[PDB]
């Protein structure tokens, strides 16, 4: 009588109806659920996520060490959302944002709502109001660690020394998630780690539908000098697609996420662009000796790459 698979399936279906689509899914599984998505500004990371972009109306957390690429991803996300005619908001609490750069990554700063809150409670409450206004596509919160409660913000003693921030951060999501979902607004929560987990990244752990583990890995040199850095991201949690997938992408100094960078990288693996030792070629054409030269190569001949972006964008999504 037992048909393990017919047996398992039924159960699984229940698991999902009881806790939501994605409550449990086979890693090898492919997707059909399209959502509505904000492109991570990275073809790979997009493919990684399994829906090509950050899901909408979901709580997202991008964490990692200082200067690793988290923000840039955040920034691209925003920009795209705006390109699609979406409204955006930045709850700042670290005063770091370089509007100039954001502009360069496609951001329309001049239309970017920005708030620089007095307390974690305010930073969080101000975002919730903005969210349930239902007119925002994306909302970015800079520095979850800076979401220090107000009791601590105002000179207050060590009595009642507590993990108050976690509570603050937690209660804040129990109430916010709902709205976001209804408002179809995606909320990235840039959560940085430094030894200047604990403190608010503990509640976001269970309230996020996607958790990216941004991290740097190699300083692009090309010949013998600085041009950029290569980041790797490991979706550690994806509740709308099989989790644990990975992705890498270049970020030349000043520039954002290199389009051609991705092209050459992905192309190679998917095999459209072959690499004999030390050299790159595409259907007879010699892109160049050395990724960088290959980048320039593609950065110049727009038609090419444009077809390999195509050839690539074809085999998948």
UniProtKB/Swiss-Prot annotation:
PROSITE patterns on file: RECA_1, RECA_2, RECA_3
Q: Name one GO biological process term.
A: DNA repair
What is seen without this gene? Answer: Not essential in the absence of DNA damage, its deletion renders cells much more sensitive to DNA damaging agents such as UV light, ionizing radiation, alkylating agents and DNA gyrase inhibitors and desiccation-induced DSBs. 5-fold decrease in survival, loss of HR, no change in NHEJ (non-homologous end-joining) or single-strand annealing DSB repair.
Q: Which Gene3D superfamilies does its entry note?
A: P-loop containing nucleotide triphosphate hydrolases
Q: Where does the chain bind phosphate?
A: 67-71, 192
Superkingdom per UniProt:
Bacteria
Outcome of substituting residue 192 to A/E/N: Loss of residue movement, loss of switch function in crystal structures
Keywords from UniProt, A to Z, are:
ATP-binding, Cytoplasm, DNA damage, DNA recombination, DNA repair, DNA-binding, Nucleotide-binding, SOS response
Q: Which residues bind ATP?
A: 67-72, 98-101
Q: Which HAMAP family match?
A: RecA
Q: What does this protein do?
A: Required for homologous recombination (HR) and the bypass of mutagenic DNA lesions (double strand breaks, DSB) by the SOS response. Can catalyze the hydrolysis of ATP in the presence of single-stranded DNA, the ATP-dependent uptake of single-stranded DNA by duplex DNA, and the ATP-dependent hybridization of homologous single-stranded DNAs. Numerous X-ray crystals have been resolved under different conditions which indicate the flexibility of the protein, essential to its function.
Q: Which NCBIfam families match?
A: tigrfam_recA (TIGR02012)
Query: How does the annotation summarize its subunit structure?
Result: Polymerizes non-specifically on ssDNA to form filaments. Interacts with and activates LexA leading to autocatalytic cleavage of LexA, which derepresses the SOS regulon and activates DNA repair.
This chain's protein is named Protein RecA
Task: Give the species.
Answer: Mycolicibacterium smegmatis (strain ATCC 700084 / mc(2)155) (Mycobacterium smegmatis)
């Amino acid at each position: 009588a037992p048909d393990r698979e017919k047996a398992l399936e039924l159960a699984m279906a229940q698991i999902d109806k009881n806790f939501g689509k994605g409550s449990v899914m086979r890693l090898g599984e492919e997707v059909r659920q399209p959502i509505s998505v904000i492109p991570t500004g990275s073809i790979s990371l997009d493919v990684a996520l399994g829906i090509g972009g950050l899901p909408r109306g979901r709580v997202i957390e991008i964490y990692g060490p200082e200067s690793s690429g988290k923000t840039t991803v955040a920034l691209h996300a925003v920009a795209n959302a705006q390109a699609a005619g979406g409204i955006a908001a930045f709850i700042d609490a670290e005063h770091a944002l370089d509007p100039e750069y954001a502009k360069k990554l496609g951001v329309d700063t001049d239309s970017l709502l920005v708030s620089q809150p007095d307390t974690g409670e305010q930073a969080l409450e101000i975002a919730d109001m903005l969210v349930r206004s239902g007119a925002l596509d994306i909302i970015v919160i800079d520095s979850v660690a800076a979401l220090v409660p107000r009791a601590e913000i105002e000179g207050e003693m060590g009595d009642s020394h507590v993990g108050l921030q976690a509570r603050l951060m937690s209660q804040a999501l129990r109430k916010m998630t709902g709205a976001l979902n209804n408002s179809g607004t995606t909320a990235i929560f840039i959560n940085q780690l430094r030894e200047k987990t604990t403190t608010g990244g503990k509640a976001l752990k269970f309230y996020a539908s996607v958790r990216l583990d941004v991290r740097r890995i190699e300083t692009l040199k090309d010949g013998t000098d600085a041009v950029g850095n290569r980041t790797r991201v490991k979706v550690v949690k994806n509740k709308v697609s099989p989790p644990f997938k990975q992705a890498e992408f270049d970020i030349l100094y000043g520039q954002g996420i290199s389009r051609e960078g991705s092209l050459i990288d992905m192309g190679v693996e998917h095999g459209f662009i072959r690499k004999s030792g030390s050299w790159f070629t595409y259907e007879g054409e010699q892109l160049g000796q050395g990724k960088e030269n290959a980048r320039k190569f593609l950065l110049e001949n727009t038609d090419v790459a444009n077809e390999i972006e195509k050839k690539i964008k074809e085999k998948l999504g």
